Amino acid sequence: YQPTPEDRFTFGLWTVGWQGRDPFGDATRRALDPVESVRRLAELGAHGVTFHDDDLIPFGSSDSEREEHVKRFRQALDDTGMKVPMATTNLFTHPVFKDGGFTANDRDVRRYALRKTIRNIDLAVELGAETYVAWGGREGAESGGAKDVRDALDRMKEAFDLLGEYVTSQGYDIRFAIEPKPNEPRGDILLPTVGHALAFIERLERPELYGVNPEVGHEQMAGLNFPHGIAQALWAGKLFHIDLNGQNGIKYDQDLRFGAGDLRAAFWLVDLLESAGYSGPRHFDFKPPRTEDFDGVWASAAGCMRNYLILKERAAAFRADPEVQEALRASRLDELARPTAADGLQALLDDRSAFEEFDVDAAAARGMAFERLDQLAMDHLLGAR
Amino acid sequence: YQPTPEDRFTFGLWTVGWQGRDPFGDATRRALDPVESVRRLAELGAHGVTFHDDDLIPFGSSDSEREEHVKRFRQALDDTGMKVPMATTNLFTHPVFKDGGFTANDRDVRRYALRKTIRNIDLAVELGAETYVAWGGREGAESGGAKDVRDALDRMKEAFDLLGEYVTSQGYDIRFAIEPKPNEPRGDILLPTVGHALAFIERLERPELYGVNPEVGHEQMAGLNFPHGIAQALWAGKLFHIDLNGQNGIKYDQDLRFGAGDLRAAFWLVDLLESAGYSGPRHFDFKPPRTEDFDGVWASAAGCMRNYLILKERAAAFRADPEVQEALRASRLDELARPTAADGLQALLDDRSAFEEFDVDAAAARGMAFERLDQLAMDHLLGAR
Amino acid sequence: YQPTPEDRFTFGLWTVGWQGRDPFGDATRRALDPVESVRRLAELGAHGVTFHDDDLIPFGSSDSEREEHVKRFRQALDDTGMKVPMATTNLFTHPVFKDGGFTANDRDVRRYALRKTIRNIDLAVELGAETYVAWGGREGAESGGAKDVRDALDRMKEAFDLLGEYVTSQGYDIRFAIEPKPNEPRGDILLPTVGHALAFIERLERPELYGVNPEVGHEQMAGLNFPHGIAQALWAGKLFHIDLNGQNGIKYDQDLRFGAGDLRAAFWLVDLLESAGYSGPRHFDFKPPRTEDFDGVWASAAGCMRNYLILKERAAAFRADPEVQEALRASRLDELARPTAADGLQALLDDRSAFEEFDVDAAAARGMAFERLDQLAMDHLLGAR
Amino acid sequence: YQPTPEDRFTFGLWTVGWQGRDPFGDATRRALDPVESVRRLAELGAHGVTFHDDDLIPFGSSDSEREEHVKRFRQALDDTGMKVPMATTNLFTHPVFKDGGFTANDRDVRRYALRKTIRNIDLAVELGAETYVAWGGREGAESGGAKDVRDALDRMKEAFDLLGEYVTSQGYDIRFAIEPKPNEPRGDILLPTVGHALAFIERLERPELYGVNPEVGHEQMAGLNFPHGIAQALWAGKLFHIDLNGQNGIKYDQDLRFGAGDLRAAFWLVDLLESAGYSGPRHFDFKPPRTEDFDGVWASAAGCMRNYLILKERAAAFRADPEVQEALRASRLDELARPTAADGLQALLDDRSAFEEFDVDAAAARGMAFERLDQLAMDHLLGAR
């Protein structure tokens, strides 16, 4: 279970660089220089790193300070062979974004947010990113009267449309990925789940440029099934990126290392990504707990990759087991994949076997055999086959 | 707060007719004849009733028994002036639907579900319904291996496409409304929220025929904000119907009368529907608690309509108050409604006032004034102005 | 992973006998004769069965019919060597209990509930049960004004006190176990968690006769940590019985087979029970999903026992690993077990090393090493050591 | 709805002084001098203020700086007539407390936490506080192996016992109030609800010195009913203090102003406190949202008191309405308050009317009339009577 760069494991600078400040506590770790994080992640077998603008260039920097920060970063990438497959903008930390960026009630803040984003799209392309993520963490409300959501969705569509116009006019080869979250830090966030994000995208001027970046813990904060949501994003052709972590149910976002939280969900998620041939980055958006020193930060990071690789082994074993393939036929997964009425509507209507002569009692008596199938999955996960 | 038929309040036969059977308990009330429910609801000031096929025609009935049941129902409608604006199919009670209807793993069950649906679309049109609802309550899974969700979504698209082909071929003037729910009775249900349903619709062959039927309590079982979800459905032009009830948070579906549960949410929901000019039925999909006799059933029903009408009064008072209109301008709701960059992308990029000369500290210091606005809303809700 | 009767695995008659009726669906399985369930569970390696009165003697039976039902049951126990370690009363299915049993607002219902309970305590002792469980599934409310909770707790204390007086007067060797649940079927149930139940017990006349019967899924419906709750019940000396199942988070009670739901929680629960030397029954209170026929019912039951035995192996391996014992010392679990101030209060106050000369920065810099410890636990659970 | 000091409304210094730092954002407001907060709260009609040690004396201060800070604070109290009814310790912000205070795995940290607490108990008594609150916000775990909960509860009992020994030895007239919370900032916190706290108290050496300080939003983060929990704390005689705020369901702790969140819960909470004659402080533990400037901070604070006073009016009107008193008798709330079996156990057993001659069908047919009662409560809350 040793990772190599071909496994496409990536990490944000803000993940291992989290200093441990929380709602009730000061930092427990000092700040990490991005150059150090690049070197240490390369040693652990990572493929690449991601960044918000402000992780890499401290807010307020001059053009000369900005150039120095980039130069040093690019040298660390050259020294390690690390890639940058994705970048994003910080439109949530600075006080100016307290009511949002793209959907701030103040128009001047909206225009600023757009300019800050465009400046970092340029840098992202320079560094070789192919996906630009957008997490609207401040887009929302704590109270009903503060945000007219129809107007806010008009302003969110206006912003993404302008960004699509910019990337096309410049000829860049980069696509956008919208990251939903249901709440935190706002009491409710706009586009709160994968579904809302998918639906919004279909009303953009150039929908082909936009997909989703779902995060395990975010969908779990709404109690939803994360592998099901990913299945719908794949079905729509919109899974452009994914953020992997863990979460123990409906509560604050924990950002535990991947494999922690709902372990069975993590197994079915890896089964799906590997079966569907997802070829994008396996990005970990996690926070080493603030109980840990730097040795525990790197242990937590290594654990993310290790657990993905164990689960991949076990899901492949499950799908290759002749006994499991028999069990899938016993539960009629083969029949689910066949069309209901390839013969057409008129044929269906004239088929007495579909209604007038259908024996509903015979059909109802047939067991689905799902519990034997799920115990074989459990036995495979635990290495008890 | 006396309702009249012009208020467009409707009720399902299964709501006031719920006999009180739950996971742990037998029925506490005897069955109601649909004719009685029509008469009693008319006396309370309702506009109309809705039905599943099997609420009106007991499952397994002959064509002669079916005709007698319809004849008697139509006479009660004629005797009272009650309308039938919506109908739906029961694809969840009979054992044959234990793994679903449209997405059952068994193909023969899928074909049966379609034929049972088409038979009731014919009856719905005969009785004058303009919306046909589809709640896939059995579409889903308790375990990961039982349902390949990509295949299931193919089968769900195939079914809705065939239904769209049927209504077009027959020339009917009826539209479909998909009702999402996150779980119960399946451990996870497919299309679990308004967003997932909206996104699915955009992949149907004839998307214009399909909208959503959201239910208050269903979105609340995922902890989501129901007025926000409705705002997105309106923004997409897909709010074809709505189910009104109450729910106390993330737990089993309670189906409390409307106004119970999250009262502030109910206020912001009525504010939105009335402001947006929603002209569809105000449908109550609720269950009088099984502690009640028939006097309490009718009291609970009357309470649904009463609470809508109080909330409508209070939301209109809130929006008409000069002090509230001032407060909305103080919180920049006016600026939210104005375009971010009507001047265009190039103008935005050349505007030094949007970035190079923007004072982020001045902008960050401006309070949003949302708490004074929300206390005026509270004072209006409570009649404390 | 073959179970034997020494593993003390037990099952309720209502578990494998669940016919599959849910809020939205009719039964999918026919009724099982208790004699058949006893025989089939013995073949699977169970130790014993449990029962509600009404599972064994249909409600309304005569004394002669009651004697016949018991006689046949006792013969099946004699024929198989199965035991009955626990029994309980059904105070939730019949309509008379729609507002509760012990805390029904109607006094005559309260008195009936007590008499029905006492009649079955007699039978429980005759059959050899040592624990009598009480699940107040109807004790609670859907609305605030319906139940004065102080008065209700007086009536619940009065009922348990009378039951304690009965068992002492008759000289029975049986103890009571109160089963908390937060909601379902009532909108909120009284004594909703292990903690509330433990606190209530300390106000009974004879607290030594009463403990708790916690259920995995019940505490999980409140988002709580089930191994922590059991740890507190053990610490108080009140873990008299336990109900094992699975649950996927905060939603309706699923009653999945044990090992399903939160698998990591199930691992830490078995670690604790085995480490603490819990010697009581391992009782499964689960429902085979209504998708299954009878072959799937017995597969689901076997799976309960299998998963407990795998988890027991893995938790014992974890605790016996020298590397894990080193890791426990690295995270100071040894120091947690030592007294804070065995030297006493005055010594603590005079110790300059506890405040005046304490280096808070040195202490704050020490990492806890919890993530390496938790990755060793994960590696042990998955068989990746 | 003008508050006066006789209404006993109090506020923590940390509430209106919250600068707006959250998991994802920097501060939006500058720090408030405690002297200013005392003066501004007095102008709004508050009765008093509360404090953590470190709110009033910056961490690390010298004895001379400490004396200056106290002197200035006491002058502001003298200048305004504000009281200090409660104080508490900060055992959660400094990095040294990252694994807890009283239950830290490191013994030296445990001893430090105790000394820091005792130093502030002395100051609390000097300033006239009668209640000392203890919120163990860092007592818990993110992972199963990190904390043996039986050992941790031994260390938590040891700490409270030592504190009880200190206050008795010094002869102070002050009592302790334990504040439960289910999670945040730890993934699970020990003593997560009112019930767990009540049960723990009964195992302390001197239980009479300890009660609970429940917080609205904390019990709501577990989906529990807050008025029910308070009813149990009152029933045990352990409601020593209460923290009032709002929360929108199961999610991160929002700390909204009181009246926001679950408004119907807030109504039933005020009904109960006033009916039970709770004579303690009405303490608001809330955070003005970080969207607000200082004008919005004071508006939010005023709103807390205003909403309590509206709800008090409406609950008193509800209880005084002859129609509601009739409705309470119709739902048998009178019978709930009468003993079940004052005649004794033997009389109950010999009463044929309690079992042999009880008509369960007649009793089951009686409706409870709860929905008419709850619509009268709603009409009273909304001022629609």
Ligand SMILES: OC[C@@H](O)[C@H](O)[C@@H](O)CO
């Ligand atoms: O909840 C925080 C989000 O997960 C962010 O880390 C986005 O992925 C990037 O801004």
Ligand SMILES: OC[C@@H](O)[C@H](O)[C@@H](O)CO
């Ligand atoms: O949760 C149950 C659903 O709300 C149904 O009542 C649909 O509206 C109609 O089948």
Ligand SMILES: OC[C@@H](O)[C@H](O)[C@@H](O)CO
């Ligand atoms: O939620 C249902 C409960 O778990 C019952 O099965 C009790 O254990 C016994 O009445």
Ligand SMILES: OC[C@@H](O)[C@H](O)[C@@H](O)CO
């Ligand atoms: O969740 C935070 C808690 O509510 C604290 O404010 C305690 O009341 C005091 O330390």
Ligand SMILES: [Mg+2]
């Ligand atoms: Mg992310």
Ligand SMILES: [Mg+2]
């Ligand atoms: Mg509905």
Ligand SMILES: [Mg+2]
């Ligand atoms: Mg149970």
Ligand SMILES: [Mg+2]
């Ligand atoms: Mg508090």
